[PDB]
Amino acid sequence: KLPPGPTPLPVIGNILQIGIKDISKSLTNLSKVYGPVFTLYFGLKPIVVLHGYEAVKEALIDLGEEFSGRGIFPLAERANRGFGIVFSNGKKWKEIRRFSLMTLRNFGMGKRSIEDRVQEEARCLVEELRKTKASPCDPTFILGCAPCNVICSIIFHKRFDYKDQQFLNLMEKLNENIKILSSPWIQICNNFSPIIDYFPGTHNKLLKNVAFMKSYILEKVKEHQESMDMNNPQDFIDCFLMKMEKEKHNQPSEFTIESLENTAVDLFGAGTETTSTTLRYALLLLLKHPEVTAKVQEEIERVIGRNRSPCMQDRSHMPYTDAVVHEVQRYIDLLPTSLPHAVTCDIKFRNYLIPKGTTILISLTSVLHDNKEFPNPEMFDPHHFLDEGGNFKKSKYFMPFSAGKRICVGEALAGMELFLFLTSILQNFNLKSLVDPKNLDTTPVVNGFASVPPFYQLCFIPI
């Protein structure tokens, strides 16, 4: 059989029992009734929900391959999103993923490392923060530019100037699509309808935005072709063309110009917003707990001092910082239900039959907020990642990037941006709150499957 669930209604399945507002709260409530594995219907569509470390680890990790499909909804084809990495399945995905993992290796693309692209961005970021002359600031935009720029430098081999028009509207489009894609109407409700697209105009703005981005990418591709150096690949495009001019005899190939721009658009989509929000929420949390910021600053001072840029080598020497960054990710739980999975064939799971192509919802929340692994899991507290001797304490339960065969492609990259951007910020600034710390609220604003910090302002005071 399928795993037990609330018994559906005919046709609207379980829809009107789900708290649409905070899905992860609802999934957790359900697990109190039906335990760690359970089924929900979203309009005939069966969705098995995994809750808790044990359930998640066995699916994602022990049954890795079987749990490796991307769950597909109406929106997947309504915004043409199954032709890059994030929303691909089968051979197309295996190939572009394995390729993309190779290229995004630290030395994956020539003599400039990923570290060096990030280090550069950290200096520019510190610079822009100086330019605000310690005056009150919504860091939203500035923090957003840094991750967007890292993506640009990884793909086109250039960073941009933060005022370069080509950069601003590239971010605008991305920012537009992101905000749209986070509407519950779009993310959810328009998915209760298999056939009729109920937001034509919206899907249109979505795709028009993609086209702008896709066309800009093509310009850079034509430029990369004319200036090709086979022995000197320098970014993601160079690598991709070389994989092409090499698959030329395996026609037709998973690697085409079209799969390139789609992969690029994927990386811009997956690479900016979540990193950007993670930084924005890190600063919020740092303001709220200035003792925490104080300790990071001690670590920076003692390990890196005020001369050079920080660098990834430093992290092994800065367990307290490391614990902070982890604890930020853990606490804010930005993707409460990851992205959706599908099984790749039919399988028995503990005690059930799950049919090839059935949608799987992983509850990351249940893992990040395990109250035995992380006592008081709703308090922000970097001690969740420290031993009683104050060394870094790894946790199997650290899954803000998911786990298994679909684990975030930017795990190592995001981990480097957060460390370098955070340590550079605090090396060069103290953070002044407007309101008093005691009043400021840091609890996540949840909208469906989306988690976001409260609006806030602060000042970046030089040292």
Ligand code: HEM
């Ligand atoms: C804090 C920053 C980030 C977090 C917390 C994060 C988290 C996630 C999560 C939860 C997934 C879905 C995994 C699943 O399907 O089970 C995901 C997928 C992905 N992330 Fe990230 N991500 C971040 C940043 C990045 C960046 C910087 C890149 C740039 C390469 C990136 C590229 C991707 C890609 C390509 C996927 C899709 C993986 C696949 O389906 O094969 N992400 N990320």
Ligand SMILES: CCCCc1nc(Cl)c(CO)n1Cc1ccc(-c2ccccc2-c2nn[nH]n2)cc1
């Ligand atoms: C018809 C083709 C036009 C596509 C389009 N490109 C851009 Cl750009 C605009 C700006 O609104 N638009 C139009 C657009 C119109 C309404 C929406 C919209 C906003 C809020 C709630 C529902 C809708 C919607 N989308 N489709 N029908 N109603 C979104 C985009």
Ligand SMILES: CCCCc1nc(Cl)c(CO)n1Cc1ccc(-c2ccccc2-c2nn[nH]n2)cc1
């Ligand atoms: C100018 C283009 C802006 C980015 C964007 N707009 C569209 Cl539409 C696509 C296709 O999904 N994309 C690419 C896209 C790829 C992956 C995601 C994704 C990656 C990891 C975690 C969540 C997200 C997600 N998907 N939907 N909203 N946010 C977001 C956007």
Ligand SMILES: CCCCc1nc(Cl)c(CO)n1Cc1ccc(-c2ccccc2-c2nn[nH]n2)cc1
């Ligand atoms: C085809 C792409 C899948 C996206 C999607 N469309 C609908 Cl509808 C569903 C609901 O099951 N879902 C599942 C879903 C889960 C998370 C997100 C998301 C987007 C941006 C930032 C965080 C999240 C997130 N991940 N887990 N919970 N919320 C979006 C959709």
Ligand SMILES: [K+]
């Ligand atoms: K319309």
